[PDB]
Structure formats: C-alpha cells, structure tokens
A = this chain, B = another copy of it.
Amino acid sequence: AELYPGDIKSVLLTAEQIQARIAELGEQIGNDYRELSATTGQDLLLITVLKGAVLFVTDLARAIPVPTQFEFMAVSSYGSSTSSSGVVRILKDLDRDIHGRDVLIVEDVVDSGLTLSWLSRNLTSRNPRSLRVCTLLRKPDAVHANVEIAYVGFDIPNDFVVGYGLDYDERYRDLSYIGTLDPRVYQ
C-alpha cells in the first residue's frame, strides 16, 4: 500500500506503535475510571472536537475496558483573533447536559493549548463531576499553557505532522500512521 507516494518524507509513529500505546491508555483510563463510573450509574463521557480526533476516539473507547459514551463538538476559529482569545466559535454544541458526568476530553494533538484551554474551561462551567484531558500527541509549545493533560500518548518535536486524523488541507487523515510532510507540498 501507499496512498500518498512521496508526500511523507519521514515516519514519526508507525500504525502498530500507535495502537499499542492506545491499548496502554485504555488500561490506564480503565483503571482510573474503573470503580467510580459504572457504580455512579453514568458511563465515561468522551467529548471529541471535530474532526481530527475522530479516528483516535473510535480506537480509544474500544481500548477502554469500561463502558464509554460519545459526544462530538464542531468548532471554528474567529479568524486571527486567536492570540488574545483563546475563544473559539461553536458550530455544533453538546447534544445533552454534562452535569454530574465524568468527562474525558479527547484530542489528537495539543500544540498551543489555547483552544483546549477555552474548551476545558467551557465544559467546567457546565459543572461536570470530573474533567480530564487525553491527547494522542503533545508538542513542545504546550508547556506554555495552563491546562493539565492527564493522559498523553506521545511527546513529539515541534514539527508539522499528518496522519491518523491529522490533516493538511483536509488530506492524509486516512493514514494509519503518523509522519511528517515533505515541504515540497506547501507550494
């Protein structure tokens, strides 16, 4: 197979290495949310921001030995008004209220941490029982944000990577692995 002949210069994470780590995260999450959630009577809620972390959440929930529910949000940026925001525009809000719920924010990659900071603070205002963050990838510039990511899959260098949900102009998401683009693509 191939799909994108030459666009991928180097391979950061292989497909097996990704799935192996996800299996580890599931057991870890499964142990942290064992006892509690199934007795509470309300499952572990997985809130996902469209649409990079869709491939990640489908594998994660099936890696978590505890029953999990899905929830999806669609957000867009208010343009360049990012730097002093970090407020993002909501295109599709939560379907139901998350009051008294154990909620796990599932992202695929955390770079700046500003859209995540607003999202995490936004969900907190809805008063859930628990709120933690699980990301597949974390880049160096996340150390400059104020949010604690309880579950991290991989710490990668500050390079633009695609694959496994990660895109460049809506492409390379269907890749099973995560790698770096070859700069003769940006044109």
- Chain A residues with CB under 8 Å of chain B are 1, 3-4, 43, 50-51, 54-55, 57-59, 61-62, 64-72, 74, 78-82, 84-85, 87, 89-97, 99-100, 118, 121-122, 125-127, 170-171, 173-174, 176
Contacts and interface: CB of A to CB of B under 8 A. Distances in A.
A70 B176 contact: no
A173 B70 contact: yes
Nearest to A1: B65
Nearest to A7: B67
Interface centre among A57, A91, A97, by most chain B C-beta atoms within 10 angstroms, is A97
A174 B46 CA distance: 11
A58 B69 contact: no
14 contacts: A3-B65, A50-B72, A50-B92, A51-B70, A54-B57, A58-B59, A70-B170, A78-B97, A82-B97, A85-B99, A91-B92, A91-B93, A96-B170, A121-B125
